[PDB]
Amino acid sequence: SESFLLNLWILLCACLVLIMQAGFTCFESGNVRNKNSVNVALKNVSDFCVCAVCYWAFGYALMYGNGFFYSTTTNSHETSFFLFQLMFCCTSATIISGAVAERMRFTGYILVTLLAASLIYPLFGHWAWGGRILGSETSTPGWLEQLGFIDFAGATVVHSVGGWMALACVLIIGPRLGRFNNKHGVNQIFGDNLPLTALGTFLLFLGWFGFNGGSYGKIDDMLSSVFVNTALGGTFGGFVVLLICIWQQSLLSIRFVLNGVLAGLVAITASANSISSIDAATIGGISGALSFFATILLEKCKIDDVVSVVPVHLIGGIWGTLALAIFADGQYFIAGNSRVDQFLIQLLGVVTCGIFAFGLPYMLIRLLNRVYPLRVSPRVEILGLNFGE
Amino acid sequence: SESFLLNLWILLCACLVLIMQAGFTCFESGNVRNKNSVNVALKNVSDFCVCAVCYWAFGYALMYGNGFFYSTTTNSHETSFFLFQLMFCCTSATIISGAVAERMRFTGYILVTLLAASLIYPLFGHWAWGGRILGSETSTPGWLEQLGFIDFAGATVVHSVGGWMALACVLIIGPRLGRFNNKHGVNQIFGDNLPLTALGTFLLFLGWFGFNGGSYGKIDDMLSSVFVNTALGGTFGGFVVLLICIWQQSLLSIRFVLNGVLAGLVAITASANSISSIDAATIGGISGALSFFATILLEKCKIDDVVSVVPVHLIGGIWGTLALAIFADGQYFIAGNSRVDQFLIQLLGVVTCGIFAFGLPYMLIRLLNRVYPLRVSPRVEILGLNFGE
Amino acid sequence: SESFLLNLWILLCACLVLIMQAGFTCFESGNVRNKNSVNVALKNVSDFCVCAVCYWAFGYALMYGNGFFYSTTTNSHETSFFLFQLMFCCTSATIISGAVAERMRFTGYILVTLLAASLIYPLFGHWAWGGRILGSETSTPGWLEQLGFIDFAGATVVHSVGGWMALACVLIIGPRLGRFNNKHGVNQIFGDNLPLTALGTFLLFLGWFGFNGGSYGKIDDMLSSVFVNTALGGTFGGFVVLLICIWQQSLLSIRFVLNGVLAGLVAITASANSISSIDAATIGGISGALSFFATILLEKCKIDDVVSVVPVHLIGGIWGTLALAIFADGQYFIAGNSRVDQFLIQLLGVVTCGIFAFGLPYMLIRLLNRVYPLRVSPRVEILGLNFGE
């Protein structure tokens, strides 16, 4: 029947988001030095396990409640939906993983991941996605969803939340040793396994297909448009950054091109079900250019992001959320809302996400760092995070 | 119709078990030294090819016969079923591969893989799964299946069999050079590509989803419960080992955490269709703890398992097989069988698997080693298995 | 309905061909030296992005027109079909990527990829596959397709075209430095990440399943035969090359074994929907042996192919195209065509593919190389292509 086919589609899409977890692991492990890559991989597995435990235990009840230790219910599609949203929560915290590499303590990162899976992501996902339970009859939406905020697959719910928490963490722990100098400016710390980073980017593209396809929530002939918009956004982001770099040398332009692919994917994540192919290409290309410029701006601002989580997930998420109101069809809006009123509503969603997913983690992680330091000692950072803290 | 959707589901699940082969290759290649990783990858491809040839030629006919060089039949679901069981047969010997790394001859490993795919796995799969032909009308079950032994996805048929012959092989060829010494105790040989082991573990999780989903054998609303039990078992195994290690340093605790993920998956493999989410979490966590203690016990017993096949596949398989009778619902048992009679039956299956998949390979591989030595010369083990034997 | 399930099948198959792109990236990045692998990964992402942009812009209109900047149409299956064929075009140019590694300039490779995605692949795909639009009512076939040429999944359209322009490129730019010498003959340049080539080969097998399954074009009970033929062709190619090598040392035989797997897949690609399992095994084994002999012949002919694109894709593609007329059932031919007439037609298709995909790219790339050199300077080849050109 229709319900069985929809259930298998959501299960295969959750499998694709597990592929996206593997791609995040490869992307982050290949972009760091060989003395820190094993710690990065251990972080990338540990946050996934901790977030799955936290979302099964209380995260699903916080995000979609009126749930705790989720068992079988009367709703047929709710188990597949729960698995998909658990994969989404793991995606948010493994976004947080990549920015804090090579200088953050493992237990402090585990505490940050617990904060992300316990309080920040379920509350904002309840605000933006409260009434989006798959197959449920009577679901009360969140206040942001009631006001008219639209996020198809989570450019704000998943990517911007992780970007804001990652920005707060890298502002609190500070930059790596030997990265920024007062005399010589900015030094580049290249990774040691950049082909693994390219493989991780391809796996992230593959997982992004499942992200958008399972966030579609139904099965008809227009899901192929969502897949085509996904492919065009990612490839046009990569193509635009490739055109910008063009004659720049390898081992530095590859990071920009892969970040452009990922940022184009982050931008089409907001509106993959409501835009055309030309709109998806335009949004992805502008997102890739914005990721390039935001990486340069973060380098000049002395903010150390190792894999450029903020130019990809945060800047791309804000651009995709704002470009939904510029490019999507008016039939997907609330009736009576024009193109500027929807821009005000999506800007309100961006500002609310910024306040809740940055300011509250900034105070909480600052208070945690005041009594429990999250930056390793300098001998650990020189020796490497593979060898203990 | 129903048959076409079921056939596509089994084909996609067999694709996921091919992903599981790729994850096994990455997990075993990253966990060894750089002078042996190419030989490990060559073993991981060659055993897959040899097992596929053997199962197409005679393995399917021995496992599910009343077949030889399988062609198209009248049964609609039996071709996808054959592909799925072929990938299961490849999974057993690629479990066998990881235990015998860095000191075993390539041709001797090919002979061991031929033994596994020719005699041991098809005969025990006929004993435990003989009547489980997908879509067939009249199928006579094996004697173990007729007695009441329940094994959903191969915790005994796949994982315990490969664990037993891997244990026999590492007992016959002996430990690696410079691994156990009489004076200073136990020395650790760390791998050189541990992020590739993390990627392999993620691919193994993803393929484990297909393992359980294709072993479900039907399509209804309860397959998402099987997927949720798979995710919760793997993540709770990893979470429990992470809680045990907590403050232990990296480059050694990552192996324990990934082994806990895999062992939790091995334990839920036995009963993923018959337990609740809390039961899946409990079984996976106990399996991860048991993998940790079994790795320690194998280190104290001077038994060299390179990637810890025995604590993951054998110990986890025995625990999952025994925990089916502790945790699963009584409606899945034979009518009239209580909770202790089922424990006796599953213990009989464990003992039968131990006898047939250990004692017969131990005598056969010992007789082969007496006339054809399966351990490399010491200059090959010092120089590396990438450079010939 | 049937249309929704077919659309989801084509979307999942296009996801599998994206996995094939990832596997190609791993296979080429692991087979080169560490001073060139980052440039190889950058090429493997850049050609994918450029080809997706080119096929969305004008490639689909040239291949399947009577389309430019493809948007939503009346045909329900055409969007998933477009995504699948875009994946096929990206597959052709990423076949081209692997032959020209370690000595070709990046911008010159981008121009070659533009030539492949703009002129060669869409025109030959229009000639061979012009009337194969999924779900269309009135589609005029190409002249080769009207003459009776059969290519199920593109052993000639995808693999032979990429092999021919890869051969033209490596004949124009020439061999690597320190590869062939007049005194000592042939020297071997081993890659530095051969386990990553094993992972890439497994990912290529996985995506090759999706290649054949989405090229099937319908859903019934005979798609499982296509999957079984795919598995048997790949595994028998690997098994035959493993039997040929047997006692040869590692670090060189693994390249032959993986190339045999891939070449068996290339040969079954032509006729996976029309042969038996024994025929698939025979075709795959002969293709693996032919890849081994063609690799030896290319090393004796002083033609430097880094990952052996020509023995795998070109020789395997020609063998699969010719073996369709030897092994497939007569019901799949044009009525009135015998077994020798179909051999003449498939040979005409092979000769037409050779002329159009070799002689025109050889002339165009020679004219481009006369005014714009595509081979790096010797200091760039000595230092490495990761550090600029």
Automatic annotation (TrEMBL), chains A, B, C:
It is found in: Cell membrane; Membrane. Its cofactor is Mg(2+). Coiled coil: none annotated. The chain crosses the membrane at residues 5-27, 48-66, 79-101, 108-129, 149-173, 194-211, 223-244, 256-275, 281-299, 306-328, 343-365. GO terms for biological process: ammonium homeostasis. The keyword Transmembrane helix applies. GO terms for molecular function: ammonium channel activity; catalytic activity. Keywords: Ammonia transport, Membrane, Transmembrane, Transmembrane helix, Transport. It is a multi-pass membrane protein. GO terms for cellular component: plasma membrane. Belongs to the ammonia transporter channel (TC 1.A.11.2) family. This is Ammonium transporter.
